[PDB]
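To close the chapter, one final illustration. This time we ask the reader to focus less on the individual chains and more on the assembly as a whole: which components sit near each other, and how the overall shape emerges from the parts.
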Amino acid sequence: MDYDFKVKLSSERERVEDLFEYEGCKVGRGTYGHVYKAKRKDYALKQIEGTGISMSACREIALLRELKHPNVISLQKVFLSHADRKVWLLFDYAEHDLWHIIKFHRLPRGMVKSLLYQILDGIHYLHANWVLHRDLKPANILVMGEGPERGRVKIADMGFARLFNSPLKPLADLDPVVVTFWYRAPELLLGARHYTKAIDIWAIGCIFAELLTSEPIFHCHDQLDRIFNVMGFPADMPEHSTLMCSLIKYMEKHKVKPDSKAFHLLQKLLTMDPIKRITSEQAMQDPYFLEDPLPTSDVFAGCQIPYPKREFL
Amino acid sequence: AFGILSYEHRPLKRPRLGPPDVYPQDPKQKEDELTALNVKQGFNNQPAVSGDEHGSAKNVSFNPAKISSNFSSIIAEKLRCN
Amino acid sequence: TMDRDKVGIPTDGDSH
Amino acid sequence: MAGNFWQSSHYLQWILDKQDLLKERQKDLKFLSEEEYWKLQIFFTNVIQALGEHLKLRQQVIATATVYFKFYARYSLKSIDPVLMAPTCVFLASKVEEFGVVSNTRLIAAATSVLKTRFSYAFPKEFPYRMNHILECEFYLLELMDCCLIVYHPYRPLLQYVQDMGQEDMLLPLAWRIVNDTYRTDLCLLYPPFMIALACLHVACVVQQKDARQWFAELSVDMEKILEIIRVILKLYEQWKNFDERKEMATILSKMPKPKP
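The assembled structure is written out below.
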């Protein structure tokens, strides 16, 4: 570890502040880090919380290095500053976040049809590469706008994503909490320590119901009561006794027809057991997408976007 | 990366095995089943080799001539079969 | 933007 | 990413030709011969293995750490002290393989204890480093290694092939130990994991006198590179026969090119 190697590396390196106007105009704040709009001297520049590299940063870097897909976010470059020992990532800018669409409408059917189809194919591709997202929220789904590609939802912010190819330790021994309680699957909420890949299916079903009713289906034992209320109690894994019809009426209250094609898929997406839950590939085979309107690559399909651009903080 | 050859689309031993190192999504693997003990005690992982998996033995004798003769026999028989 | 036959099969990916 | 090796970053960029390895090792060869460099690489691989074994680690994490160590392929050996390369590579491998982050004092104590109990002759003095040095070194390594943190291993193809063959008790230990031994060479940087697994399986079946001609006959793969891998493994085993750590490593590390302050 000598001076000449350091000076040569510094000469080879390029400074992030010397190339991008990341200062100011912060566009997103969260527990993952800070997201800014940046341009060369538009991209989303993300600074990760915490000095040095943490488990989230290491997983992020080791996962999006080798994953490539039209429906999956892809970083273009990474910067590593030694003065303060923190990490900077550079994704392509995604103007519209699904949370913004949900909030603005509080709605074409083909739009939600295509959006669900695209998220299902993306999560199927993710499951193909033998990895678990372990976090699906409406704020983690981003939509391109008025660019070279329209629509084309992108899954991102997979800091909690972990490979499940072969577990050296149980998946719950190093992460008691994997996702927010609004979308926690019943299996892990019942204290399961080894959970399969079906949790993401439950999450996508929950968010699909949220877009169907334009209102959070699950709102706040804090969520177990709501889970039992929304779709009844299972009368047909651990702490079974320690815990101490409704779905149809709940969907009817939101002016959704009980007898339709979307309702059957939504009902079959959410089950109390992992074995009977459908996997990603069978979701596309559901003739729900087949019925008109057929899913589109462009969600807007030529319509003007009424949602405003993301605002600064 | 044109110089390197890829066996991605060439199955190895087609009757019993598929692509050499590409791993499809098997529907009957050990990472999807949920037994009563698997949920409670977590994933049960046991060492691939009983005893010392880390340990590597080099004190056992090797005969390079015998190995070379066997490999020559294998390649000659494969040429004869094809 | 209509793809009748493409609905059944998922996209393989960007690949190389 | 797993399940598709031919599109992963480990194969697209980190598979290097032997010509590049010979060209980039000239700077390290200006002070030591090929034999001394090879012996030094074997010794430091053994040090990494011992350090991983002391911390009660698995085998995949130690293999990943060894692959990370085998940085020196494209950079000079005098750039960073290998005695500090080993613990930081082990720490990064443990961090990335989802095994958990080791403690600071735990890692320092483990390194010092190992160096003082089984490598005292090579290093008469103590281990004079702190955790900040380890952190900055691993940060540099993550910076300049193109952020390729997923390393494939021949273990999965080896288990698949032995399960396909049918025998699992007489052949698996020998194949596993041969795969463990083959990490001393540079084959991991040269050939795909399944070729190494096939070569190790062939060696294991030939050693224990099992008729495997019919099994190897049907499989369709290049049958010339496997011969090269067998030759490399045989050269490893033959050269390891008359090599003593205690008698020589003191002399080689006496000739070690140390970095400047």
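Chain D touches chain B through 49 residues (CB under 8 Å). The CA atoms of residues 5 and 11 of chain D lie 7 Å apart. With these observations in hand, you are ready for the problems at the end of the chapter.
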